[model samples]
Target: KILVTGARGSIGSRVAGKLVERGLPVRGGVRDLAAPGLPEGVEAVQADLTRPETLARALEGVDKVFLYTVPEGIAGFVDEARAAGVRHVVLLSSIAVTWPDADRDPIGRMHLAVERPIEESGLGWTFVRPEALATNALGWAPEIRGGDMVRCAYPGAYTTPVHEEDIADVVVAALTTPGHRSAAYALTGPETLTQAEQVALIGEALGRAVRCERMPEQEARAVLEGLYPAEVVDAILAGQAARDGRPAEVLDTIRAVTGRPARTFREWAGDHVAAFRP
Candidate 1:
């Protein structure tokens, strides 16, 4: 059996669904056992990563884990895994951990905190390091559904955002297939796009015109600080600033691992148009 933490989350839930599609027996570790929307075929178990004591039942009979990174409860989870004899772990990590200023990048440091201990724990591990996720555009959904403009800080920050389903597919492969142990795959979408380009793509998917309006740095900084930690907000803004209107890197890791090309942002947009439509 495979245990998937954060099963209610976007990527985690999708991973559970994909694993079940492969006919693997899967368990979902959810803080709320009553949480709705877990796909069929996943056994739900109450396991809060912050509270280690709640993890035992979830680890029972589990041979592998799709772990969601959290600084807290990881030690307890690892302790349970050791006793439960889990052989492998697939971690959802960030590419920022390998970026130029990783040492100073708060997001990178956050992922590393969980990664280092997993490595030291003697469990075979595979890290899925993705660039910006296409789902990040969901942030614009509300505004787009309500209007024709996507207003944000940087209009030219470049990214080849990987589809969440692609992330799930890769994780499923690593969990059920071989040759991925101890590997770190840098995943990306089919093409590079700026923030404005992304908004335009969504518009195309919606069959309407949408404009991207850039906000002043101070204004954007203020809005971001309200939503995230000051350090994280600063790092995100700096990362975008560093792009300097150039496209981010793209990779063939998805195709190489799954024998298929990664889905495009346009595909993602089309698939999720309802979320941005009235």
Candidate 2:
């Protein structure tokens, strides 16, 4: 059986669903089975990464793990997985870990903290590093549904925003397949798009002319602080500033690993049109 931690999260839940669809036995490692929208047809177990004591029960009878980076108690979790005879670990990590300034970036450091330990854990490992998530566009939903104006930050910043399902597909493939041990796939969308271009796609998907007003760094930082750690907020603003006028790199790794093309941002917007609908 495979154990997928953070199974209620965007990436993890989809990983579980795909695994189940492929007829692989999966057990979802979740903090709450009572939470609505836990993936169907999986055994839901209470697994708290903060509390390493919970690892034993969660890893029981599981041969593979789709791990979310929690950092704390990670050594203990790795130890427990080794003891439980777990063989492969597919980690949902960030491409920031590979950035040149990663050592100075809080977001990158957070991911690396968990990644380094797993590398030395002696078990097989695969890192699925997503550059920017298309879901980041969901932050504009409230503005789009409430009005025509999207007060977004970093208008000039460009990113190859990847679909979450594509990330999940690579994660599941790494978990169950061979020749992926110690491999790190830097995943990205098929096309590079500016923030405004992405907003335009969402508008197109919703059939509205949604306007994007570029938010200033100071104002953007203030608005983002309440939703993220101050350090992470600073890192995000820094990344946007660095990427201004320079589009992010697009990778063929998703297609290389999954045998299919990465989904387009327009396709992602189309799939999530309801979120942008007034």
Candidate 3:
């Protein structure tokens, strides 16, 4: 049986759904089984990623793990997985984890904090350090549909946003197939573009105009702090090193494993245009 941690999360839900659809006996670990809309035949266990003591129950009899960088008792959690004889941990690490003296940036520092334990756990592991998720655009869903203006921050800022679906697909490949263990991949979208350009692409896809208006960095932090909390917001604000005009480089890991090209940000934004429609 395969146990997926955070199985109800955006990427985890999608990955687990696909596995079950293909006749894999899958189970999900969530903080609350009371949460709704779980795919049928998947066991829902009360496993909080933040609570290491509870992780052994989730790891019991499980073979593969779709793990993410969560700030919790990760060291003990990894120990539990090892004792449970779990193999193949697919970690959703971040490029920020590579930051030298990651403490210089709060977010990078957090990634480092989490990764340190996982690397020492002696469990077979693969990491996908993806660029900003395209689904992050959902942060603008409300204002975009309320009017033509897409109230956003860093409108002129550039990134090669990888679709979360792409991340899920890569995870699926790693779980069902072979050859990804002990390796780390730097995932990216097909191209880099400014935030305004991404909005324009969405407009083209939906046959409507949605202009992106830039907000000051501080203001943006305040708004996002409510959703992600102060710790994450501070980490993001300190990650200024990621946006120094040079976009992250693309890697062939996805195509090498999945034998398909990763999706472009334009294609991602275009497909999700209704998410921005008024």
Candidate 4:
């Protein structure tokens, strides 16, 4: 049986659904069993990675797992999975782990913490490290729903925001196929788009014009602090400043892994346009 942790999350839900569509024996590990919405045929179990005691039942009888990064209790979780006879783990990691100074970045360090234990656990593993997720665009939804203006620190900052579905496809392929053990795939969308351009695409999807306004760094920092830790917010803003006016690197790994080209941001915008509607 395959267990998908964080199955209620965007990428995890897709992973679980794909596995079920293939008629795989699937179990979904969620923190809240009462919280609904796993794929129809998959069994749901209460599992919290940060709490190792909650893992035994979730890992039982499971041979493979689709995992999310949660550093705390990871060593214990690895032990339990090994004891439960899990052989393969497909981790939803971050491309930031490939950065030269990854050790110095909070996001990089966080993912690395979860990865290190898995690497040393002797289980077959595949790391799906994706660049900025297109779902990050949802950060602009509230502003767009309220009006036409989306304000941020760097309007010109560029990123190849990958679609969640693409990430899920790679994870499913790694889980269901062979020769992927110990491989790390760096993934990105097909196009490089500035933050302004991304907002404009969302407007096009909404069939209206959406204005992109630049907020002062200090103000943006304050606003973002509510959503993320101060250090993460600072790191994000600094990264955006560094990438402003420069396009991010786009990769073909998604197509190479899934045999289909990565979806475009325009497609992502179109798929999620309702979030921008009032």
Model 4, residue pairs in steric clash:
none
The reply for model 1, stretches above 4 Å from the true place, is: none
Tell me how candidate 2 scores on lDDT.
Answer: 0.90
Ranking by TM-score: 4, 2, 1, 3
lDDT of 4 by residue, 37-115 (tens): 7779989999799998899999999999999999999998899999999999999999999998999999899999989
Question: Residue 205 of model 4: what lDDT?
Answer: 93
| Top candidate by lDDT | 4
- Give me the displacement of residue 96 in model 2, in angstroms: 0.9
The model with the greater lDDT, 3 or 4, is 4
User: Residue 261 of candidate 2: its Cα lDDT?
Assistant: 99
Q: Give the TM-score of candidate 4.
A: 0.98
Instruction: Point out where model 4 deviates above 4 Å.
Output: none
What clash pairs does model 2 have?
A: none
The per-candidate count of clashes, in order, stands at 0, 0, 1, 0
Instruction: Note the Cα lDDT for every prediction shown.
Output: 0.90, 0.90, 0.77, 0.93
Report the error of model 1 at residue 172, Å.
0.3
lDDT of 2 by residue, 110-213 (tens): 99999999999999899999999999998889988997787767787899999999999999889877879999999999999988888888988888887788
Candidate 3 structure, TM-score to reference? 0.91
Candidate 2 displacement at residue 195 in angstroms: 0.8
Q: Tens-digit lDDT track for model 3 on 1-278?
A: 88887788888888888889889988898887897877777899887777888887888888888887786778877888899998878888887767577677667776777677778888888888887788877887787677667755666667778887788888888788878887777787877776777777777776778798877778878898888878888666544335545555666665776778888777887778777776
Better of 1 and 3 by lDDT: 1
